[PDB]
């Protein structure tokens, strides 16, 4: 997970 993928995961909490 890169920058765009971590904020996405952190957002929905994966």
């Amino acid at each position, epitope marked *: 997970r890169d920058k*765009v993928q971590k*904020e*996405y995961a952190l*957002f*929905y*909490k*994966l």
Partner: antibody
Amino acid sequence: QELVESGGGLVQPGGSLKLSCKASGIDFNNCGVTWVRQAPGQGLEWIAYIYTGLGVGHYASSVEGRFTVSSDNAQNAVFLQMTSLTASDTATYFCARDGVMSGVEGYYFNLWGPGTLVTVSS
Amino acid sequence: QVLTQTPSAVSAAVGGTVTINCQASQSVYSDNWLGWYQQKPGQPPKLLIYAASNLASGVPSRFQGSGSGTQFTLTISDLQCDDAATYYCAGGFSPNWAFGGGTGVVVDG
């Protein structure tokens, strides 16, 4: 590149109903599938979310504990199980897919379905 | 969360300019989680502006997004008849999203 939701119809107050969201052109592998309902002549309402990656589901307070989002990948499709229904649940239910685009735009609902209408009454 | 939208309806002429204000009850997770959707009757919504100020792929330059934190604004320039629809602001707040009440845009031709 297409989505279709099925299962809508007339249901009695308190009854249940399972809605489905099938894809026809893409897959639900490692992406978010969101459900958005819209009462007749009303505004959009975010209700539930589910990430097909590791089955992470989120629900709005209006459907807290009464609904359930499923992601049976068999024949790539997402489901929405509605338990104790009420008149307020009458609306057109959409499903949207994220990650279709590239970059930050992928966060948002890129691909939508035509919507399935659910009517709750006696 | 609550994204109070203003106005609820606006009447503007072809080529004019319309402004829609979206006030959020609390700060969004970040400016990368605030978009604007265009919806016409009988159709599903359509993404118009993402990241609060980025023009979605395929959207004309007439649409501009601005704001941050909790106050956002949508601006439609050179209003055309094809822009006749209802516009919603959706903001992400970590686990859930929140849609504004909507703003119907009528175009005088």
